[PDB]
């Protein structure tokens, strides 16, 4: 086929032939990496996240509950699972359903960290998409919508169910509450969705102790066969508590009681168990190893760890300390008058509404003096903010308030008074507008030195050098408070977080500061008890907020809440399942997984191929020297529009640490779309498949003919079978003389390619037609040589495919014997996939892809 094009007049350029071979060779090599799908994401390599992603991401139709605590990376873990299944072909269509306020968070995270462009489906986008198909969700492969959107219409819900999704992601799944007599519409929608999508990821950090019926109902959504009875599940969790405590004491060091181990041995039921148990419970020279084998066999028999992952902050340390600094300020008489007239108008207004309103006195003032009324003239919080920023000009400060209107007013007064420039975040801006404001604030280069945020939820952007936070006001519930602090209290952040709270005395602000700090300790330590206690004392705490002058019993309430907080906190830590924690973080095997990816990171093959790829496609690279390159298209582009480019130009980097510091830059790996789209572009057609060249070599007779043939050995099969793990389309380069000697083993490609020069068209065409009959005789000589070569590759693959898939099949069958969380369809998927892989490798052959004729000259 390629020689027919050559003898018919197609002569390709030298760089096209070379790049075609290189791109096929590197594609063949990068597919077989054991860590594919975990390299391309713009994240740090945290072992507990990679352990979850590497386990769940390679399953057939994964159905797990991701229950890591707040800030531990549930969005990143879900993104890594999506990244693998989409890259490998195991999934094609993904549906992410989140609370309405977290939609933009997931769009930014999935695009800027995993290169996944999701489509937000709201009511206006839904009506737009209806014009194109019967099912409007068929118009996009990756969509995000809200719980309210999914539940609102039965007809729209049916379309969402029949849209043939491969993976379903539900964030903040604790919003799905089990109710025996009145399940919410959003519960019913997710329940129906979960029966129609094979792969489901439920995300919620809620402890099962704060609600057990809902926790079991979420697990039953994942596997209704295993989790079929609630009372049985409750009894299982009770029966297991002594085992988790005895195990916890083991790793803690204190040795075990006689009856405490025959209880570990009963749950690990097997005949010869005494030697291992005694070796572990000895603290000898062998006990260190003996416990890893012990807990390993206990994790395989754990009742829920196969489908439930829960890392904790006490288990995975690495979060910064949080320091509270309160600043009590006098109440100006303008607010005194505004509050009084407000109380005269709201004698009937509910205590709940009065409590919330008086938290933001600039809104009370404007509600009587008009919008944009000059409250910033007398508000002492503004003056304190002025003095703090003017005396801290070299550090990045993040200021948060509830309302955008207040945040936008602060930007103006701070600019008009002290000349300080501030980036602003609020819900009224576009994602791209917030992208610029973020990059402006991220500059250590006299960037924006203060970032002003409304209550808008964080979109995952990392501000490395930001460790100082000002709460201009306080949010109304403790869940919003931790979301605020989480903007800087990030994993891997080393500097202590300074939280400054300027507040007005004897107002609802002063009451809320006391309750958050003294009652919940919510500022300096992450609060797992806030919501639970807040619900119990809501209409009680509201009264003290609404009437800050009458403080009778407030100290008693604070005492009540703090004692309940401390008790619930310590109880959650006692019930912490250490065996579940170890399975969640992955131990030393996960640390090795993190090291292996970081070693693979610095890829000189990639930089080489990427620059060779961009020259041919026609991209102009401007190396800014700072580990960053600016890509701008040129005139001589192959395709008019190459996917990832814009006429404004994009910034790229190959270094993972630079990519984390500059999220405005593309993180180029073998798994980046720019690379995968460039590979497919040059390997799609026939460009570079047929050419002729001259070799200036005096050590060889004039006119001697060599042909270098690029064969490709491949099987044909659907991508979901994942045949590329064992036999991707693989090039087999041969270099033949007139007798058929294969010299490719002693003639390195790049060394020999640098000596082959193109021919002008008129001489080149004359030369090809002259040597044709000899070339045909050499082509016939190769067909026998490629056969033995291709048969060695296929037989190598079908043995490696049979060996790998036998291990996976045996591993899942060993688990099913001791674990109830192995689904029937999982065992059938491996058994069927293995048989189909063997059958596709049986029908694998060879073809000639490209050939380059070489004629020796002395000129
Ligand atoms: N490996 C990582 N590398 C870089 N940033 C990370 C990593 N893991 C987490 N982050 C950031 O830390 C923050 C917390 O991540 P999340 O996954 O959202 O935390 P989460 O609380 O477990 O999940 P939700 O859905 O937000 S409640 C985000 O700003 C992430 O971008
Ligand atoms: Cl050329
Ligand atoms: Cl919602
Ligand atoms: Cl419940
Ligand atoms: Cl400073
Ligand atoms: Cl953000
Ligand atoms: Cl407040
Ligand atoms: Cl007040």
Short mmCIF file of N, CA and C and ligand atoms in Angstrom, two decimals, residues 177-178 210-215, ligand 4:
data_model
loop_
_atom_site.label_atom_id
_atom_site.label_comp_id
_atom_site.label_asym_id
_atom_site.label_seq_id
_atom_site.Cartn_x
_atom_site.Cartn_y
_atom_site.Cartn_z
N UNK A 177 -30.49 12.12 51.81
CA UNK A 177 -30.92 11.67 53.12
C UNK A 177 -31.95 10.56 52.95
N UNK A 178 -31.77 9.46 53.69
CA UNK A 178 -32.74 8.37 53.65
C UNK A 178 -33.97 8.73 54.47
N UNK A 210 -22.96 10.03 62.74
CA UNK A 210 -23.90 11.14 62.75
C UNK A 210 -25.18 10.81 61.99
N UNK A 211 -25.16 9.78 61.15
CA UNK A 211 -26.37 9.17 60.63
C UNK A 211 -26.04 7.85 59.99
N UNK A 212 -26.70 6.78 60.43
CA UNK A 212 -26.37 5.44 59.98
C UNK A 212 -27.31 4.92 58.90
N UNK A 213 -28.58 5.31 58.96
CA UNK A 213 -29.52 4.90 57.92
C UNK A 213 -29.15 5.49 56.57
N UNK A 214 -28.75 6.77 56.55
CA UNK A 214 -28.35 7.40 55.30
C UNK A 214 -27.03 6.83 54.79
N UNK A 215 -26.09 6.56 55.70
CA UNK A 215 -24.82 5.96 55.31
C UNK A 215 -25.03 4.59 54.67
CL1 LIG B 4 -29.32 8.68 58.92
#
